[PDB]
Amino acid sequence: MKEKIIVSACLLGQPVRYDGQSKGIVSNWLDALGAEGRALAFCPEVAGGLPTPRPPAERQGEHVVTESGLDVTAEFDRGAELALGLCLAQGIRFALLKEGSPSCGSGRIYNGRFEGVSMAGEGKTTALLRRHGIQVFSEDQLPELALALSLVATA
Numbered sequence: 001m002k003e004k005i006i007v008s009a010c011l012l013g014q015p016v017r018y019d020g021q022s023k024g025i026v027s028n029w030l031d032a033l034g035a036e037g038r039a040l041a042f043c044p045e046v047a048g049g050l051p052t053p054r055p056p057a058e059r060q061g062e063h064v065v066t067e068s069g070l071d072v073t074a075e076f077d078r079g080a081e082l083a084l085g086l087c088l089a090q091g092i093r094f095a096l097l098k099e100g101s102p103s104c105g106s107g108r109i110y111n112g113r114f115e116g117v118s119m120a121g122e123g124k125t126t127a128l129l130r131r132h133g134i135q136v137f138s139e140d141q142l143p144e145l146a147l148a149l150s151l152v153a154t155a
């Protein structure tokens with residue numbers, strides 16, 4: 001059937017990023033999906049109770065902290081669980097999440113040293129969704145996500 005996906009709200013142009021900006025991507029496919037009511041916007045950090053703007057944060061293994069040392073893991077873990085809850089309730093098995101984020105990253109994240117250095121890894125929400133069988137794609141993998149969603153359309 002024409003299934004739904006969960007999408008990082010910033011990729012849809014919502015100004016929920018830590019700096020109050022958006023990461024709206026130019027995509028005819030994603031626009032069409034949204035026009036059909038199939039792209040459910042979700043921001044784990046805002047759902048988890050963090051404000052907008054909010055200080056930058058990085059993973060330090062299981063913890064998520066700001067540069068000043070404030071531990072925000074509780075909010076990151078709440079937002080990841082709420083993303084999973086929305087997927088389970090709506091029967092969603094695919095996610096399109098923002099690359100590099102301590103919540104939404106899927107191929108890379110910042111290394112926890114607050115020095116602008118990236119490493120291979122995933123954000124807290126991506127890790128939880130993948131652990132529960134949900135496939136996560138970044139905005140650099142739109143062709144792959146669009147194909148994965150198109151293969152189950154006639155079922």
Ligand code: SF4
Nearest residue numbers: 008009010017043104
């Ligand atoms: S937590 Fe994810 S959806 Fe929310 S602004 Fe950051 S990258 Fe975008």
Ligand SMILES: [S]
Nearest residue numbers: 016017018101
């Ligand atoms: S963010």
